[PDB]
Amino acid sequence: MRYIVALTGGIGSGKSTVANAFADLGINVIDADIIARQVVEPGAPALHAIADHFGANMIAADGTLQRRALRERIFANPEEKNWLNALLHPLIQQETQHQIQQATSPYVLWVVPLLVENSLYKKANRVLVVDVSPETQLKRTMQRDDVTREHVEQILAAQATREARLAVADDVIDNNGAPDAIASDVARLHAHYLQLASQF
Numbered sequence: 001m002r003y004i005v006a007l008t009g010g011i012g013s014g015k016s017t018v019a020n021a022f023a024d025l026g027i028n029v030i031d032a033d034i035i036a037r038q039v040v041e042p043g044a045p046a047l048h049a050i051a052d053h054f055g056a057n058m059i060a061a062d063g064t065l066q067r068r069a070l071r072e073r074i075f076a077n078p079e080e081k082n083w084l085n086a087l088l089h090p091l092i093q094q095e096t097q098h099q100i101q102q103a104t105s106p107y108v109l110w111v112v113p114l115l116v117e118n119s120l121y122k123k124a125n126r127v128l129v130v131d132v133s134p135e136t137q138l139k140r141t142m143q144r145d146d147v148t149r150e151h152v153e154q155i156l157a158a159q160a161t162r163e164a165r166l167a168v169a170d171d172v173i174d175n176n177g178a179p180d181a182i183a184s185d186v187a188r189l190h191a192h193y194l195q196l197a198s199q200f
């Protein structure tokens, strides 16, 4: 069982800036969002199974999963939510575990945007939260996605509070400012995690 450090943070926390710094130190980074999207990408067996089970309306114009349609369809249908979890959870867990086993670094960085929201923190040895202000989240998302302020407000209202993230945090890193000093902060975390990984 390779030592797992979960990285989490809200929308617009600039998580890639922190993850890249660990990658630069030779840490294998395993991205939960990339894996989840991969499992249901066009041509993937789980996407075919979802379309067969729920219908062709689950497929968007570009061939990808219509995620809103699926959510609405399984919403308040517990049997179908249980079916969808029984399909996707083993597939995602198996790909995640495969990437962990293939990793060569002394510990891995598991990047999980919805770590708190989905109660997944118990799967990691250590939780690092990327801490940012709501203002920073709002600014970065609006510049990134070309979306309205009110649209980001709704996303923030639905995500975890900062106090909620810290409740499961072992480590916090402020990423409100410029990315310039992050590698220096991460260098210290990295040394600590090599120590923690060695005695785990």
Ligand SMILES: CS(=O)(=O)NC(=O)c1cccc(CSc2cccs2)c1
Residues within 6 Å of the ligand: 004, 032, 033, 036, 088, 089, 090, 092, 093, 096, 097, 100, 112, 113, 114, 115, 118, 123
């Ligand atoms: C929506 S998500 O993209 O935030 N992911 C998930 O819900 C999800 C579901 C099942 C499994 C895993 C990895 S469990 C693990 C396995 C080994 C080390 S850690 C994640």
